[PDB]
Amino acid sequence: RKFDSTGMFHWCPDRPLNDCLQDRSQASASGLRNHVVVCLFADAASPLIGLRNLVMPLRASNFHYHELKPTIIVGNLDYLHREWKTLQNFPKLSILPGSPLNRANLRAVNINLCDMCVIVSAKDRNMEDPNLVDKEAILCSLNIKAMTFDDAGANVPLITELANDSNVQFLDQDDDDDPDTELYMTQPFACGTAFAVSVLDSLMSTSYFNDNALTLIRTLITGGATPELEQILAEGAGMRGGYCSPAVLANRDRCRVAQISLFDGPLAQFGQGGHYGELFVYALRHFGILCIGLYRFRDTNPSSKRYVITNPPEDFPLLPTDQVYVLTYK
Amino acid sequence: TFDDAGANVPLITELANDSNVQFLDQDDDDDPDTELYMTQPFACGTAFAVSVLDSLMSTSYFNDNALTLIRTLITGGATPELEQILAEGAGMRGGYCSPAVLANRDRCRVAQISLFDGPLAQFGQGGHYGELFVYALRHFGILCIGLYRFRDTNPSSKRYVITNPPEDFPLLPTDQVYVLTYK
Amino acid sequence: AANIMRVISIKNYHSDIKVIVQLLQYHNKAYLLNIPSWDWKRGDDAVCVAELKLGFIAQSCLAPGFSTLMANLFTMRSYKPTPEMSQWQTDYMRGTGMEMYTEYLSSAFNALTFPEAAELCFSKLKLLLLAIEVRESTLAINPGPKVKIENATQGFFIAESAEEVKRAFYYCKNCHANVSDVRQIKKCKC
Ligand SMILES: [Ca+2]
Ligand SMILES: [Ca+2]
Ligand SMILES: [Ca+2]
Numbered sequence: 091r092k093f094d095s096t097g098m099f100h101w102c103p104d105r106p107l108n109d110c111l112q113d114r115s116q117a118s119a120s121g122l123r124n125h126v127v128v129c130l131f132a133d134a135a136s137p138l139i140g141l142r143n144l145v146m147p148l149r150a151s152n153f154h155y156h157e158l159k160p161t162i163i164v165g166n167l168d169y170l171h172r173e174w175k176t177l178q179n180f181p182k183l184s185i186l187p188g189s190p191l192n193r194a195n196l197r198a199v200n201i202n203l204c205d206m207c208v209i210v211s212a213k214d215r216n217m218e219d220p221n222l223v224d225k226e227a228i229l230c231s232l233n234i235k236a237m238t239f240d241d242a243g244a245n246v247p248l249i250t251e252l253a254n255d256s257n258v259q260f261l262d263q264d265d266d267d268d269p270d271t272e273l274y275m276t277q278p279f280a281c282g283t284a285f286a287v288s289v290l291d292s293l294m295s296t297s298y299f300n301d302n303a304l305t306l307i308r309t310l311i312t313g314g315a316t317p318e319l320e321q322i323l324a325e326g327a328g329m330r331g332g333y334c335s336p337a338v339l340a341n342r343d344r345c346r347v348a349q350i351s352l353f354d355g356p357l358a359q360f361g362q363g364g365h366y367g368e369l370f371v372y373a374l375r376h377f378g379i380l381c382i383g384l385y386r387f388r389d390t391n392p393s394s395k396r397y398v399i400t401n402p403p404e405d406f407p408l409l410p411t412d413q414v415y416v417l418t419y420k
Numbered sequence: 421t422f423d424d425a426g427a428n429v430p431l432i433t434e435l436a437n438d439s440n441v442q443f444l445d446q447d448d449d450d451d452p453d454t455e456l457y458m459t460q461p462f463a464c465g466t467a468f469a470v471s472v473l474d475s476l477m478s479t480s481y482f483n484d485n486a487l488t489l490i491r492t493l494i495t496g497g498a499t500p501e502l503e504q505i506l507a508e509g510a511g512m513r514g515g516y517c518s519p520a521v522l523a524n525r526d527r528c529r530v531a532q533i534s535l536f537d538g539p540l541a542q543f544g545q546g547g548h549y550g551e552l553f554v555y556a557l558r559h560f561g562i563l564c565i566g567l568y569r570f571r572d573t574n575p576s577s578k579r580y581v582i583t584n585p586p587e588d589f590p591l592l593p594t595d596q597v598y599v600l601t602y603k
Numbered sequence: 604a605a606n607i608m609r610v611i612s613i614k615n616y617h618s619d620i621k622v623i624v625q626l627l628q629y630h631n632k633a634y635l636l637n638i639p640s641w642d643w644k645r646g647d648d649a650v651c652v653a654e655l656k657l658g659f660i661a662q663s664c665l666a667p668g669f670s671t672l673m674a675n676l677f678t679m680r681s682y683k684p685t686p687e688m689s690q691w692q693t694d695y696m697r698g699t700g701m702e703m704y705t706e707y708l709s710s711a712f713n714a715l716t717f718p719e720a721a722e723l724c725f726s727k728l729k730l731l732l733l734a735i736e737v738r739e740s741t742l743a744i745n746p747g748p749k750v751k752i753e754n755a756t757q758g759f760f761i762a763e764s765a766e767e768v769k770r771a772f773y774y775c776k777n778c779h780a781n782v783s784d785v786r787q788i789k790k791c792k793c
Contacts, residue, residue: 493744587729
């Protein structure tokens with residue numbers, strides 16, 4: 091199969107947006123499952139958010155073509171026409187034009203079967219006062235959280251990007267909000283359900299103190315965008331690609347952050363009251379897996395909310411329902 | 421002029437600003453210190469404005485069922501299931517219907533009837549509203565709630581509404597009666 | 604949008620609060636119907652003024668004066684004569700003193716049909732009964748002879764004041780409420 095000219099991403103020859111546009115009947119006829127849904131909120135004139143930066147990590151060349159998550163953007167078509175010039179080189183993408191708040195678009199898209207729903211907005215950052223600034227994103231979250239998918243609802247996985255951090259309080263219930271808590275301590279951020287640009291401020295100082303650490307995170311979060319690819323994109327030709335030589339295709343063995351479950355398979359022995367240090371050493375030795383944290387249920391008994399524990403102590407007790415973040419090659 | 425008239429076409433206008441009701445009619449005797457509900461165009465049912473709906477808020481607090489009563493009348497039967505179906509964004513879904521759902525086509529409605537002819541006309545010749553009320557309830561299951569009467573009892577076609585008259589209230593043969601009815 | 608964010612805030616703080624909100628556009632009602640904890644069965648309600656506005660004038664196309672008939676029942680007002688008013692203005696204004704009230708029918712109404720209960724309210728009590736809450740429970744407007752008054756049936760009345768409709772709760776038949784001037788009904792079937 092074809093890759094970008096540096097072999098880092100899966101690639102597709104150009105297309106017209108009408109090759110990937112779908113109505114609700116076409117979208118519903120397609121068996122979308124384990125996909126990514128992007129619920130974009132845009133006016134036709136609103137600024138470009140660069141969805142290429144969302145899609146490109148999902149097309150990293152270290153995935154096999156059969157395991158690439160299909161992606162569907164629900165949003166304004168006139169906006170997506172001017173976005174499209176950047177997106178047209180990625181395989182398995184599709185567009186359902188219309189509002190993400192329509193509870194039909196959501197059902198056609200199989201929102202209950204997706205692996206992640208992304209809620210994102212291109213609207214003006216002070217279209218009005220700071221209470222209105224995220225009302226579409228909040229309504230979209232609450233809408234999805236309320237639906238019923240009787241052949242549910244508040245168990246669709248979701249991540250929303252907030253224009254104004256204090257609006258995180260509206261984003262979840264069973265929560266105990268407090269406006270004097272800063273974003274990183276709130277339950278939606280601790281669960282990975284919310285994100286806001288304010289948490290990225292301290293990257294500036296890390297670029298000063300250790301620039302290599304910023305290249306480490308960029309190679310992880312971009313899925314392998316090298317400075318050569320940034321150079322090629324700066325020539326304005328778009329992302330050039332085709333069939334690739336074995337010598338560049340060698341870079342498809344990139345380390346990635348995956349997540350694994352202690353419920354079944356060889357590590358499940360640690361789920362029955364093992365400790366994180368026993369798991370860490372075992373997995374590093376047997377698999378070259380490097381464990382960096384846990385994703386654990388908040389309700390240890392009810393809700394599906396899970397919270398992230400970065401780098402636990404060696405003696406930290408495991409639960410059979412835990413999931414482990416791992417750096418891995420395969 | 422509709423020569424084969426004119427000021428006898430029935431009309432209802434919705435006002436963005438209530439004090440403009442004064443311009444809406446002539447032979448009227450306007451006064452800016454009167455509030456909308458006392459003006460002749462509102463008393464005749466020719467004008468409407470959103471300001472008369474303000475006090476629905478407090479009725480939703482004091483007796484929510486009364487607000488469902490009026491909503492079932494004014495919408496012609498929009499149930500919360502229809503509001504739910506419309507909230508799915510598919511638009512209003514429909515088709516042929518089963519006899520079991522079609523059973524709901526016998527809804528009570530507010531109609532209007534005339535004392536000029538037919539069985540009630542006996543009350544138009546100097547009967548009283550209480551005699552009419554009891555008779556119609558018993559013979560027809562009609563529940564009379566008010567009158568629509570000509571303002572000029574002699575000229576113009578303007579009629580005004582009398583809600584729930586006294587039992588002894590005198591009828592005119594030109595009156596029309598508001599009725600809750602099934603058929 | 605601002606009002607929806609306020610209901611979202613109130614419900615976020617505590618889901619069980621009865622929220623009554625005024626809305627200006629009918630398409631905006633869909634947004635708050637989709638909040639996780641909006642529940643009409645518990646009392647939450649949206650007075651959509653566009654829906655109501657166009658509903659009253661639509662029923663006026665079918666009954667030529669209903670919007671005035673009906674919009675006067677939902678504001679409290681008391682009839683107060685002034686001697687310069689014409690006959691039609693005194694007749695009209697007496698009618699504006701009416702509102703719609705809810706009250707429990709007394710036990711003296713039990714096992715009457717709605718038509719007997721309505722004749723009785725009108726002729727003896729001087730009250731216009733127009734509906735009943737049938738026992739979960741459902742509103743019935745002008746139900747036919749098939750429907751009986753059950754014990755503790757709530758009825759909807761048109762009357763001048765809440766002090767009028769109490770008469771239907773205190774009406775005690777041959778036991779005590781025997782006498783023919785309506786001001787006298789005020790005490791039980793002792
Ligand atoms: Ca909250
Ligand atoms: Ca005038
Ligand atoms: Ca009154």
